[PDB]
């Protein structure tokens with residue numbers, strides 16, 4: 154079987170973020186042009202998807218972590234991860 | 243276990259679309275800057291991926307819904323969802 | 332049950348790439364504006380995610396293929412697929 158991943162990137166360097174779901178936990182690895190390192194994101198989930206967008210040169214990331222039938226949105230706007238407003242119904 | 247999602251976004255507001263596969267059915271939730279609401283997309287699938295692109299300010303979305311070994315592409319060009327030309331072989 | 336896919340696109344034509352994981356093998360289908368055709372990517376994986384970015388008009392693609400707990404990054408910079416530096420720890 155296997156872990157499940159999601160990936161996003163931005164800019165021209167680029168920056169890359171890769172999220173991995175394994176045993177109900179999602180972790181994050183990061184590339185900013187030099188090498189890979191572990192990111193701050195660490196939240197529960199069996200499944201993960203991600204999207205991101207720039208405002209000028211500032212990144213915003215949304216990570217959708219699902220356990221069973223519950224999907225939690227996690228927000229990065231440049232200063233820490235927080236739960237977002239997403240609901241499924 | 244859990245549902246499986248895919249996500250896309252565009253612009254700077256942004257607009258966000260989150261697709262969720264659960265019990266062989268995919269549904270869609272939408273954010274356009276104000277709050278989340280249910281979108282028009284509703285098609286069968288155990289698995290889902292998505293990509294989207296802008297022409298100027300008009301969005302185009304492609305959703306790849308898979309059941310067993312059959313992957314159906316669904317197209318949004320601004321005026322309703324239709325099946326696209328994608329085939330796997 | 333079902334195969335698992337990931338998708339990316341770029342430009343305004345657009346170009347689209349759709350990766351499908353089935354039986355521990357990932358393959359690639361390609362659209363460049365005319366029709367769909369099979370791409371060069373063919374590597375092992377039970378799970379797949381993808382991201383891509385432009386430099387001017389040149390595409391770069393990163394495909395994250397996972398089997399069990401091992402995630403291999405595959406790089407397209409315009410001249411063949413190679414393994415990238417990604418590690419999970």
Ligand SMILES: OC[C@@]1(O)OC[C@@H](O)[C@@H](O)[C@@H]1O
Nearest residue numbers: 170181183191192193194229
């Ligand atoms: O600079 C790395 C970092 O701050 O980038 C944005 C997010 O990916 C964070 O989780 C991560 O720690």
Ligand SMILES: OC[C@@]1(O)OC[C@@H](O)[C@@H](O)[C@@H]1O
Nearest residue numbers: 215226228230237238239273
């Ligand atoms: O800044 C956070 C937020 O408003 O960003 C846009 C959407 O992701 C919302 O669900 C989320 O609460």
Ligand SMILES: OC[C@@]1(O)OC[C@@H](O)[C@@H](O)[C@@H]1O
Nearest residue numbers: 259270272280281282283318
């Ligand atoms: O305005 C919402 C909407 O039209 O946006 C484009 C697609 O996401 C549609 O399914 C969705 O109903």
Ligand SMILES: OC[C@@]1(O)OC[C@@H](O)[C@@H](O)[C@@H]1O
Nearest residue numbers: 304315317319326327328362
């Ligand atoms: O406008 C629909 C279409 O031509 O868009 C590009 C690709 O997604 C094709 O498979 C699809 O039929």
Ligand SMILES: OC[C@@]1(O)OC[C@@H](O)[C@@H](O)[C@@H]1O
Nearest residue numbers: 348359361369370371372407
């Ligand atoms: O022109 C098609 C192609 O070269 O595009 C870039 C990558 O998707 C390759 O695997 C693919 O064969």
Ligand SMILES: OC[C@@]1(O)OC[C@@H](O)[C@@H](O)[C@@H]1O
Nearest residue numbers: 184393404406408415416417
């Ligand atoms: O050109 C290849 C490379 O440097 O591209 C950026 C990242 O994907 C790295 O892991 C990878 O080795």
Ligand code: NA
Nearest residue numbers: 188189190191
């Ligand atoms: Na250090």
Ligand code: NA
Nearest residue numbers: 277278279280
């Ligand atoms: Na209303």
Ligand code: NA
Nearest residue numbers: 366367368369
């Ligand atoms: Na031919």
Ligand SMILES: [Zn+2]
Nearest residue numbers: 175176399400
């Ligand atoms: Zn284990």
Ligand SMILES: [Zn+2]
Nearest residue numbers: 221222264265
């Ligand atoms: Zn159930």
Ligand SMILES: [Zn+2]
Nearest residue numbers: 310311353354
């Ligand atoms: Zn089979």
